[PDB]
Amino acid sequence: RDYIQSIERGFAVLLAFDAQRPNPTLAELATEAGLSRPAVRRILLTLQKLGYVAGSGGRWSLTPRVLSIGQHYSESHALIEAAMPRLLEVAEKTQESASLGVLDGADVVYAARVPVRRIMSINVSVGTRVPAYATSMGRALLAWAPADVVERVVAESTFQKLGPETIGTAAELERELAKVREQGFALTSEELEKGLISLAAPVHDAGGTVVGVVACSTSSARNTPAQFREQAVPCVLAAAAALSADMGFA
Amino acid sequence: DRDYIQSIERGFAVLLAFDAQRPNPTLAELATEAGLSRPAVRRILLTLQKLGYVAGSGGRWSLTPRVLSIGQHYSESHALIEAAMPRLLEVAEKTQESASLGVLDGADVVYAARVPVRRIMSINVSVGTRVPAYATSMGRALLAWAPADVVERVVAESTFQKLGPETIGTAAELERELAKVREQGFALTSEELEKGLISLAAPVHDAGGTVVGVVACSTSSARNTPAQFREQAVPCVLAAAAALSADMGFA
């Protein structure tokens, strides 16, 4: 009708790949994608012609051309490049990795990252997805968002218990959103994962629309939430403010 | 069995039509760029919208962040290492020197891959060895075309301590070195990491134009002068980096 299911299946094949299993057979991909082998074979051959996969010896690999499509999101969103120097200022000051988060349905996606080298690794790459309900980024992105947006997120939010302190209910989400509006930032402790503490502050575009958040995380082994707030809040808010200015916010 | 699904090609053609020049384009702008009819592109946009990859409003369209999540199903570093091996062997055979792939990690360069040669008196590096970006050919070739914020991080995290007789000691000096590298197309250093050690590195690119590593090669001043080594080794360090760049889809 207006729905091209093969496009869906094309993505399903790409997403069936595991970063840690770089060279699967057709059969492994089709089982992962939940698609028939003839479907997967035809998709693979198309993706190969387009330069996204390479096939050899019954096995298949992604190519770097697979990162190229993602790079178009960044190229067409100037906030990403502008973010980098501001995130570096956060990472240097705190010695904690600094990120730009953007809303994508019920998830937040890490759109840009300045990592710090520890073994005590708070591990996410660009394109990593985390639920909005359970994160500081989520809350700083939803605190000033429309009610319909929020409901649409809530409807899709699994509200899993991910850490010892993860909120349970949407009624509870709403109480955290209220705090964020009063604070001007979100703080979460042990909600996305055991031992994980995060701050995030909203970034505004020229219209005063919250288009992203500057975020910084620590381990509870390094700081208590109150310590992390006292230490890191000033530079997280200053980074978001500058980034907002960069976008033409007044 | 047809081995080709056109609408998958068209889906990508539409996704790729969004860029710095078309951040929020209309249907007509997208259809023109993709080389497709507007009805076809309309149907593809509506499918991509349902899948959460684009968002449409007021006759204009945007990529959502969802496309970012595709790349995380890939390790480029693993792939670069695998593709590197044959090219590094080529370099080791032509130069008679251990050939390495270097990658950037913060202010350090890591020896990601290595093809060693056999000498009694040897240049000793294992995979995983880190050397500072500020003091090395590999560092300089990894930084010379890197975004300002990447160079800025290195600077903030570098000690700039003297390691060999000729190590640069300042950000201003590093910056001058990087300009020389942009102009040369490769880095050459001598005596900056250790007395008697001379090094060359050339940048490697992937499909998206990003410098993803360097092909590198070192010698001893007992076997070569810096000018001598640059003569005999640069051509094939360059050819190896260019061949590996191609393996990685660089146009």
Domain ranges of chain B: 1-74, 75-251
Looking at residue A169, what DSSP letter applies?
-
**CB-closest option in A19, A43, A91 to B73:** A19
Cα three-residue angle A217-B77-B159, rounded to 5 degrees: 60
Provide the token pair at A103: 């809303």
* A26 shares contact with chain B (CB less than 8 Å): no
CA distance to partner chain B, nearest, from residue A139 (Å): 18
Residue numbers in A near B204 (CB within 8 A): none
| CATH class given for the domain over B1-74 | mainly alpha
CA dist list (Å): A50 to A30, A46, A54, B4, B112: 19, 6, 10, 10, 29
**Residue in A133, A136, A137, A174 with CA at minimum distance from that of residue A157:** A133
* B84 shares contact with chain A (CB less than 8 Å): no
CA-based nearest residue in chain B for residue A128: B69
Is the CB of A69 less than 8 angstroms away from the CB of B1?
no
CA distance to partner chain B, nearest, from residue A89 (Å): 9
Report d(CA A59, CA A24) in Å as an integer: 5
Is the CB of B72 less than 8 angstroms away from the CB of A11?
no
Is the CB of A109 less than 8 angstroms away from the CB of B62?
no
Which residue of A1, A3, A4, A77 to mutate against B (max B Cβ within 10 Å)? A4
Strand pairing report for B130-132 and B108-115: antiparallel
| CATH class given for the domain over B75-251 | alpha beta
**CB-closest option in B22, B50, B65 to A109:** B65
Is the CB of A78 less than 8 angstroms away from the CB of B23?
yes
**φ, ψ for residue A222 (rounded to 5)?**
-95, -30
Asked if B227 and B175 count as a contact pair (C-beta separation under 8 A), the reply is no
Is the CB of B149 less than 8 angstroms away from the CB of A71?
no
Report d(CA B183, CA B235) in Å as an integer: 16
Beta-carbon count within 10 A of A30 CB: 21
Report d(CA A193, CA B117) in Å as an integer: 47
**Which CATH architecture best describes the domain A1-63?**
Orthogonal Bundle (1.10)
User: DSSP labels for chain B?
Assistant: -----HHHHHHHHHHHT-SSS-SS-BHHHHHHHHT--HHHHHHHHHHHHHTTSEEEETTEEEE-GGGGGTGGG--HHHHHHHHHHHHHHHHHHHHSS-EEEEEEETTEEEEEEEE----SS-----TT-EEEGGGSHHHHHHHTTS-HHHHHHHHHH------STT---SHHHHHHHHHHHHHHSSEEEESSSSTTEEEEEEEEE-TTS-EEEEEEEEEETTT--HHHHHHHHHHHHHHHHHHHHHHTT--
* B197, amino acid identity: L
Which residue of B68, B75, B154, B157 to mutate against A (max A Cβ within 10 Å)? B68
**Residue in B178, B221, B225 with CA at minimum distance from that of residue B203:** B178
* B72, amino acid identity: Q
- Which of A 181-240 lie inside 8 A of B, CB atoms? none
* B128 shares contact with chain A (CB less than 8 Å): no
Breaks after residues in chain A, judged by C–N over 2.5 Å: none
Helix, strand, coil % in chain A, rounded to nearest 5 = 45, 20, 35
Resolution in A: 2.3
**CB-closest option in A7, A71, A73 to B11:** A7
CA-based nearest residue in chain B for residue A17: B73
* B161 shares contact with chain A (CB less than 8 Å): no
CA-based nearest residue in chain A for residue B11: A7
Is the CB of B8 less than 8 angstroms away from the CB of A3?
no
Report d(CA A185, CA B71) in Å as an integer: 30
Asked if A214 and A98 count as a contact pair (C-beta separation under 8 A), the reply is yes
**CB-closest option in B16, B65, B249 to A63:** B249
Q: B225: Cβ–Cβ under 8 A, 6 or more apart, which residues? A: none
Give the determination technique: X-ray
What's the number of CA atoms in the CB half-sphere (13 Å) around residue A53?
30
CA-based nearest residue in chain A for residue B44: A4
Secondary structure class of A133 (helix, strand, coil):
coil
What angle do helix axes B27-34 and B6-16 make, rounded to 10 degrees?
Answer: 120
* B125 shares contact with chain A (CB less than 8 Å): no
Beta-carbon count within 10 A of B4 CB: 12
**CB-closest option in B11, B19, B73 to A15:** B73
Encode B198-229 in three state secondary structure. EEEEEEEECCCCCEEEEEEEEEECCCCCHHHH
Residue numbers in A near B76 (CB within 8 A): 64, 67
Report d(CA B10, CA B47) in Å as an integer: 12
Report d(CA B151, CA B144) in Å as an integer: 8
Is the CB of A70 less than 8 angstroms away from the CB of B70?
yes
**φ, ψ for residue B75 (rounded to 5)?**
-105, 105
CA dist list (Å): A154 to A105, A131, B50: 10, 11, 19
| CATH class given for the domain over A64-250 | alpha beta
Residue numbers in B near A81 (CB within 8 A): 147
Looking at residue A25, what DSSP letter applies?
B
Which residue of A73, A209, A211 to mutate against B (max B Cβ within 10 Å)? A73
Residue numbers in B near A91 (CB within 8 A): 153
Which residue of A67, A84, A117 to mutate against B (max B Cβ within 10 Å)? A67
Report d(CA B30, CA B63) in Å as an integer: 12
Report d(CA A6, CA A47) in Å as an integer: 12
